[PDB]
Symmetry: C2
């Protein structure tokens, strides 16, 4: 099997080495396409390919049709918007991503941000400590679970809410977390259910010095609601890796508000090698055993 | 026993409550002197005092002489130069601080700064993770041991150096820590030996993407050495709660250098209440049982 690796933004050298090792041992061929400047470059190369690994590169219909006998394309990372899924279905091409490969990067950023917020951005003033505080974890997926492990490590007590997962001690109503926890960590997927869900009435319930850290999406916040409660509750802190739309937070709440300029939760060298190497092992597995765990598309075999 | 509590900057209300509880339960009386102005306020009130708890307040000879039957003063905190130790010796007054009460504050600041450093100050760019990296702890006293616990909790591998205390696995020479660890944390006292010890030759040995986090003293760094090596090694990161003297770090090394505007390691509400109640507890213990653990002075009886 020939495996082409298409990356305008190349993986780090040790990641490439690892992808090589996983596939050459099994033992397939690996062919790199790195820093290509022209759509045709990838088209020439992909014609003989059985498999593909990509990062955020656009894999469109033409490219996919050039890939006559490509059976599988693995996105090293979370999103796959960059790949034409319908054109892949048309061609009986299994499409995967690599879920859970950024979890520690996002969780450590959450913990760092919590310490940062509790310490006034490492500026002058009276700080607080995470040890012995109760953390309310919202979403107990990949990220949520790792945050629990780190938060416990540093000596926080834990409560959890997640309406999609069943886990040992979860609280039933999210209101309960906000009542009973000093610090809230948000790791929920954005849906109609969760859209705008974190708003005035809920946030209001936090105890004095309450803190909310958001590593997920801006849209699960009710921005005007959070603004209202922060204006009346000057003790509340909000730290987020997903900047709000409203410019009010930055204008009014300095000293108890921080947003990264860009979502950096997953921007770690480790996240990138974890994803690249997961992509390799998942492709090895597909050809070895037909394993299609993490397949994000589906098609008929008529 | 009458115990007076002298604080221009008062304790938080719950700290006061806990200090009250500890002393009134053992049968003593607590007199609070908060927000006071002048010095008369303290002198008049200290006359009848058997003991004193203070923070950064200046306690000079005049005040100490006013307290004729004062037997013990406890500084809720680390330092105690605010107290005239000579006058307390002359007076046969036991003086204590409360060591180890700010340890978690400094340790959490250290880990926070490490994540911060590794994630470009929470700005755009390629970050790294502490999990699975090897941390070299320099100094394994109160702060050092707590940093060990937190760093372990979040998945770092640990190696330690401390020429003062003997611990299970310590390395013999600092050079070994700097060769074998990705991240170094500094919690060493400033000493003839430690002064300017962290310098060019030592730092240069760090692996690629090396990071040093200092929460102790600025003086254990050889600033010119650190400057020279950071200019050569653009990969190296330096984060500190004790800002350097030289302007160069801020001018040249943005993106791989941060210093807090002042030392905030111990500035947490918890550190303050830990210290206030340790002081109360150390006074109860002194009167109840004559315990003089943490006494920082000595005198002829």
């Amino acid at each position: 099997m020939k495996i082409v690796v298409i990356t305008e933004k190349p993986f780090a050298e040790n990641a490439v080495k690892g992808i090589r090792e996983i596939l050459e041992k099994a033992g397939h061929e690996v062919v790199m396409i790195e820093k290509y400047k022209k759509k045709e470059d990838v088209i020439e190369r992909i014609k003989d390919a059985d498999g593909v690994i990509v990062r955020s590169d656009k894999i469109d219909e033409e490219i996919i049709k050039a890939g006559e006998k490509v059976k599988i394309i693995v996105r090293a990372g979370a999103g796959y918007d960059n790949i034409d899924i319908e054109a892949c279905n048309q061609g009986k091409i299994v499409v995967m991503n690599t879920p859970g490969q950024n979890r520690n990067g996002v969780a450590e950023l959450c913990i760092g941000m919590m310490i940062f917020g509790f310490r006034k951005g490492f500026k002058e003033g009276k700080g607080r400590e995470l040890k012995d505080k109760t953390l309310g974890i919202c979403g107990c997926g990949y990220v949520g679970k790792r945050v629990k492990e780190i938060a416990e490590g540093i000596g926080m007590k834990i409560k959890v809410y997640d309406p999609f997962i069943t886990t040992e001690n979860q609280v039933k109503k999210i209101e309960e977390l906000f009542e009973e926890c000093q610090v809230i960590s948000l790791h929920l997927p954005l849906t109609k259910e969760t859209k705008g869900k974190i708003g005035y009435e809920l946030i209001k319930k936090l105890p004095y010095g309450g803190m909310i850290c958001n590593t997920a999406r801006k849209e699960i916040i009710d921005e005007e609601g959070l603004i209202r409660i922060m204006r009346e509750r000057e003790d509340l802190i909000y730290i987020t890796d997903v900047a709000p739309t409203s410019k009010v937070f930055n204008n009014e709440f300095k000293g108890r508000f921080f947003a990264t300029p860009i979502k950096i939760g997953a921007e770690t060298e480790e996240s990138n090698i974890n994803a690249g190497m997961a992509a390799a092992s998942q492709i090895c597995d597909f050809f070895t055993n037909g394993t299609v765990k993490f397949q994000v598309n589906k098609f008929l075999e008529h």
